Amino acid sequence: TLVRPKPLLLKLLKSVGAQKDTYTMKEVLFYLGQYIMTKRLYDEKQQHIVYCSNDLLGDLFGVPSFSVKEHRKIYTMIYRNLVV
Amino acid sequence: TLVRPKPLLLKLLKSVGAQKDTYTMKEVLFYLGQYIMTKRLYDEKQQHIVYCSNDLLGDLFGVPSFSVKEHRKIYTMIYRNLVV
C-alpha cells in the first residue's frame, strides 16, 4: 500500500533526499530512521531514547520525546501525518 | 525483484536488525546505509567519503574506501555478494 505524507512529514522526508510524494510505510519508516540518525536525536548511551523537542520531528509528533519501543505511538504519529 | 545476500552480506544486514534472508535491492541499500551510519564509517566533513578498511564492509567491497558517488562500484559490490 502506498501512503501519501502530509506537507510537514513530506518536508522531513525530502530533507534526507527522498524524491517522491508517495512511499510504502516501510519506506517512510526507513527515511524517518535516517532523519533521526542524521540529526542525532537519539541518546548515544541508550539508543532507543529520542529527544525531539523544537525539532521538525517534535512538531510532527506533538511530543518532546519518545522511546523507539513505543510502536503504537510512532505508528499513530505517522498516520496522523498521512493523506488517507 | 527479491535478492538473496551471500553470508557475509547477510551478517552485515543482521547486525543492524534485518530479520530476513531475502530483500529487495532498495531494502539492501537501506540497511547498508544504516550500517555505515551506525559505524560512522563516513567522513563527518564531506559525507560522501566512506573509509571501510578492516571493517566487514571493506571485506565485502575488497577496497579500503569509496565515495558514495561511485554508484557503479557500490552496485557491483552488492551484486558480487548476492546469490543470483
Binding site: 530512521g33 | 544504516q34 551510519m37
Partner: peptide, 11 residues
C-alpha cells in the same frame, strides 16, 4: 542494541 536495531523492529 543500536538505534537502527531498535528502529528496525517497527517494520
Amino acid at each position: 542494541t543500536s538505534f537502527a536495531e531498535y528502529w528496525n523492529l517497527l517494520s
